[PDB]
Design a protein around this ligand. Structure first.
Ligand SMILES: CC(C)CCOP(=O)(O)OP(=O)(O)S
Ligand SMILES: CC(C)CCOP(=O)(O)OP(=O)(O)S
Lengths: 260, 248
C-alpha cells in the first residue's frame, strides 16, 4: 500500500517570516508519522510512504526576487544567480525537515527535483530511484523546487504538481493533504464525503460566492483524486493526532473517494 | 563546444582530514575557471561546461561508518540512517563548492545523483535536465554520491563513472581530469599519451585503474593533469594539452 502525505510550507513554516520554521509543529508532525509507522509495523501491514512539502518561507521569498511580469505574464530573470539561490533555500528547508524526521528514526531521504525534472506539458520526472527507495522501506521526501522547462524558460514545480504526478506514476492508494483548515469547507464546515454522486455539485459550489476558499485550491485537489481514481483526505494538519489518524485511514476532515 | 572538468576530491579536500576543505585551492580553481569562461566570452565562442567533483573529505569518512567487510565485498549497513547521512555530507560539500563558484560569477547549479540515479544493470541517469541547463549556459555541478543499486542495493557512484557516462551521453568534445599528479604515472613518470598500442602494456602494469578503462569503453578522449599547479586548469580548459593524454 502506497501513501503520499503532503505537508506544505504553511503548517511547517510562517510564510511572512522568511526562513522561518515552526519547530514545534514540525516536531509533533514527525512524532505522529513515527507513531504511525510504529502502528503499521505492530499490526503487520505493509506501508510505503512518500512525503511532499512546499517552499514555505524558503522558496517563495527567494524566488519572488527573480520573477517579473512582462506583457502580463510570469518570467524568470537573472537565473544565472537565481536557479542556485532558490535551490539553496529549498535544500536548507529540506535538510531541516529531514534531520527532524530522522531524529525520530524515520528513514527519510532527499529527492531534489531541480536536478532532474524538466517541466513541460508533460513532466519529465524519472521515478526509478524512488521506487527503489520505497522498495527498501526508505521514506522519500520530495519538495517544491525550481526547474527548467522545455521552452527556454523556468518553472516552480510545487507540491500541487508533484503529488498528482506521483499518484499517477506510482499508483498511489491514499493521498493525504495536511492543510491549515479542517476540510473542504461548505458553510464554514468540512464536508464529510465527496464521491461520484456529489462532486460536480461540490465543484460548482466551490466556484461560487459563498465559498470560503476562492483560490480554487480545493478544486484542483478534488479533481486530481478523481482523475487518478483513488482516495484522499483533506484535513487540518495543525491539530494534534490528525496526521497520525490520517495516516491510519481515519482522520476526520473531508474524504474524497474515487477508488475502484 | 562542450567540455567536462572533474575536480579530484583530493585537490579540494584533504583526504586525511575528515571535513576539511582546501580553501585557497578551491578559490584559486574557481578563479581560473572564470578566467577561462571569460577568455571564450571574448572570442565570441559558445562554450558549454559541466563540472564534476568527488566525495573528498566528506563522502568517504561518512560512507566509512556504513561500510562493513563481510568477508569479501563491502557491505552497506543501517542505510535507514546511512543513506541520509551520506546525502547530507555530500550536500554540504556541494554547497561549499557551488557557493565558491557563484562568488566568481560562474553560473553553477546542483545535480544531486542520489535523488534519481540508479546504478546496477544499465546505469539509469536521465540527462534531460542537464541538456536543458546547458542550453541556458548554466554550469551543472555533479558530485560523487550514494545511490540506489537495483541489483546490489546501494553503491557509491564516483566521478570516474559520471564523467565518461556523460561525455558519451552528451557527446562532449574535451574531457579533463584534474588530480594531484602530473598525469598517469608509469615508473614515477607521466606518459605523454595512451593508445590502443601501449595500452596493452599499461593495464598489465596497473595491476586510476578504473578511470583509464571506463573511458576506453566509450571511445572517449581525456586529459589527466595536475590540478594543484597554478594555471593548469585555465590552460587545460583553453585546450592546451597538460600531462597525460588518453585517446579512444
Ligand atoms: C518558491 C517555491 C519553490 C515553492 C515550492 O512549491 P509549493 O507550491 O509546494 O510551496 P508552498 O506554497 O509552501 S506548499
Ligand atoms: C560519496 C562518495 C564517497 C563519492 C566518492 O566519489 P568519487 O570517488 O567520484 O570522488 P573522490 O573519491 O573524492 S575523487
Amino acid at each position: 500500500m502506497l501513501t503520499i502525505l503532503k505537508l506544505g510550507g504553511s503548517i511547517l513554516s510562517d510564510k511572512n517570516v522568511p526562513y522561518s520554521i515552526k519547530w514545534d509543529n514540525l516536531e509533533r508532525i514527525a512524532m505522529e508519522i513515527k507513531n504511525a509507522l510504529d502502528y503499521y509495523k505492530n499490526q503487520n501491514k505493509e506501508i510505503k510512504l512518500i512525503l511532499v512539502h512546499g517552499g514555505g518561507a524558503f522558496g517563495h521569498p527567494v524566488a519572488k526576487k527573480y520573477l517579473k511580469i512582462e506583457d502580463g505574464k510570469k518570467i524568470f530573470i537573472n537565473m544565472e544567480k537565481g536557479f542556485w539561490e532558490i535551490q539553496r533555500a529549498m535544500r536548507r528547508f529540506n535538510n531541516i525537515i529531514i534531520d527532524t524526521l530522522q531524529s525520530y528514526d524515520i528513514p527519510a531521504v532527499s529527492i531534489q527535483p531541480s536536478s532532474f525534472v524538466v517541466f513541460g506539458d508533460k513532466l519529465i520526472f524519472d521515478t526509478s530511484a524512488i521506487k527503489e527507495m520505497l522498495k527498501r522501506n526508505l521514506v522519500p521526501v520530495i519538495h517544491g523546487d525550481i526547474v527548467i522547462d522545455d521552452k527556454n524558460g523556468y518553472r516552480i514545480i510545487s507540491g500541487d504538481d508533484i503529488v498528482p504526478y506521483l499518484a499517477n506514476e506510482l499508483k498511489a492508494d491514499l493521498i493525504l493533504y495536511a492543510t491549515d483548515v479542517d476540510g473542504v469547507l461548505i458553510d464554514n464546515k468540512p464536508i464529510k464525503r465527496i464521491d461520484k454522486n456529489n462532486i460536480y455539485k461540490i465543484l460548482n459550489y466551490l466556484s461560487g460566492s459563498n465559498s470560503i476558499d476562492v483560490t480554487g485550491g480545493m478544486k484542483y485537489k478534488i479533481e486530481m483524486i478523481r482523475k487518478n481514481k483513488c482516495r484522499g483526505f483533506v484535513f487540518n494538519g495543525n491539530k494534534a493526532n490528525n496526521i497520525y489518524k490520517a495516516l491510519l485511514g481515519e482522520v476526520e476532515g473531508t474524504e474524497i473517494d474515487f477508488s475502484e
